[PDB]
Amino acid sequence: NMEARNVMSGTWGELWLDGNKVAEVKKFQAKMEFTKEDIIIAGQMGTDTKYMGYKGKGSITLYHVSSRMHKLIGEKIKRGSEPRFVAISKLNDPDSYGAERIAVKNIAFDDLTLADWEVGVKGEIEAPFTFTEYDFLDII
């Protein structure tokens, strides 16, 4: 049942941001980090933990072909009104069992790159973010 062809390749990934497809996407990450507190029980040598919540962290990397992030957030951040976004990530490798599609919601970006260029180097943009919600569409 398990064969090397079933492993999902990242070249078959696709991304939508604020309803618009992002053809220049290089990578996408989203992960929930749990908050755990140690608890020592009387009479027990092994220390246990209590689950308290989670913090959502992620990032997007794009080839620099346009001013997408500038238009999304620049003017609003200066005025003090922070916008929030929805992203949809899809991974559909034809040799895998099926598609994995996930919506990541209430996204707030961590920064904004105005310029980053070097002679002899092609342009790339790294945009970390935080989030609180998600939904499963097409799990395997």
Partner 1 sequence: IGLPSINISFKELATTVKERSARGIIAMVLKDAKALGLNEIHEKEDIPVDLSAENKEYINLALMGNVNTPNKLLVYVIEGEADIQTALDFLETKEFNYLCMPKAVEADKTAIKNWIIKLRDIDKVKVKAVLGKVVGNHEGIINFTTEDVLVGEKKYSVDEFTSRVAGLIAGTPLSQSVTYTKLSDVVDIPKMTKVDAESRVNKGELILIKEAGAIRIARGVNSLTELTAEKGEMFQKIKIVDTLDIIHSDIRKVIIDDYIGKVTNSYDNKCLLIVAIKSYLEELEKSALIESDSTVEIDFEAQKSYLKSKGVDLSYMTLQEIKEANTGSKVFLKAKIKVLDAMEDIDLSIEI
Which residues sit at the interface with partner 1, rule CB under 8 A?
A: 1, 16, 19, 86, 88, 90, 98-99, 101, 103, 105, 135, 137-138
Q: Any contact of residue 20 with its own copies (CB under 8 A)? A: no
Q: Is 5 helix (H, G, I), strand (E, B) or coil?
A: helix
Q: Any contact of residue 6 with its own copies (CB under 8 A)? A: yes
- Residue type, position 81, single letter: S
Rg (CA), the chain: 19
The two structure tokens encoding residue 11: 């070249």
137 binds, among partner 1, its own copies, none (CB under 5 to 8 A by kind): partner 1
Residues 48-107 binding its own copies (CB under 8 A) are 48-56, 58, 61, 63-67, 70-71, 74, 77-82, 89, 91, 93-97, 100, 102, 104, 106
Minimum Å gap between C-beta 57 and its own copies is 10
Q: Pick the closer one to partner 1 by CB: 44 or 120.
A: 44
Among 24, 72, 85, 137, binds its own copies (CB under 8 A): 24
How far apart are alpha carbons 129 and 72 in whole angstroms?
14
How far apart are alpha carbons 59 and 131 in whole angstroms?
10
How far apart are alpha carbons 103 and 95 in whole angstroms?
23
99 binds, among partner 1, its own copies, none (CB under 5 to 8 A by kind): partner 1
Minimum Å gap between C-beta 16 and partner 1 is 7
Which 8-state DSSP code applies to residue 8? Answer: P
Cβ burial of 134 (10 Å; 0-12, 13-18, 19+) is: middle
